[PDB]
């Protein structure tokens, strides 16, 4: 499967994803990284890795649909099969999300449905949970919404700060984002017609 990563900044987990695709039995290759913002660190990560990049500036388009159509055209040109969102900060239009239904993954630094929205590590600490985690899911129209592929529980430790909790969750993300991509890229996990996850036994051995 040919994979695009959409970013807006540092491309968190992008290196984890690249490294996983270089493993011997990978089902995925990262073929393009697209940012809506010029000269961000995630672009440099992609370029240093030899991966094509594009910048699509939302200010050059009249509205969200036209902007997202420009993203989709690049995806079409590069024959992309699967999109991963790695810190992408714009809300994708309904038409775009519908088109990519079941082929677009995002990650969130909580065990959804807990701690939706921004600042999930601070929300976990303020709430006083002892277990948090991260979640990889298919993207649906409501943000953080969409069917869950993988989750990993991560402990909150006595004394944690936002920084120490965030680095522990990030280590889990580095595990589950590539693992989820491989499941989807291999066809082991697909989104069924019923809109629920399907774990498929593949014909090819």
From Swiss-Prot:
(6R)-10-formyltetrahydrofolate binds at residues 64, 89-92, 106, 140-144. Residues 3-203 are annotated as: GART domain. It comes from the Eukaryota. The active site is at residue 108. The record marks 144 as: Raises pKa of active site His. N(1)-(5-phospho-beta-D-ribosyl)glycinamide binds at residues 11-13, 170-173. Transmembrane segments: none annotated. Coiled coil: none annotated. In the N-terminal section; belongs to the GARS family. The N-terminal ATP-grasp domain carries the phosphoribosylamine--glycine ligase activity. Homodimer. Trifunctional enzyme that catalyzes three distinct reactions as part of the 'de novo' inosine monophosphate biosynthetic pathway. This is Trifunctional purine biosynthetic protein adenosine-3. It comes from Homo sapiens (Human). The gene is GART.
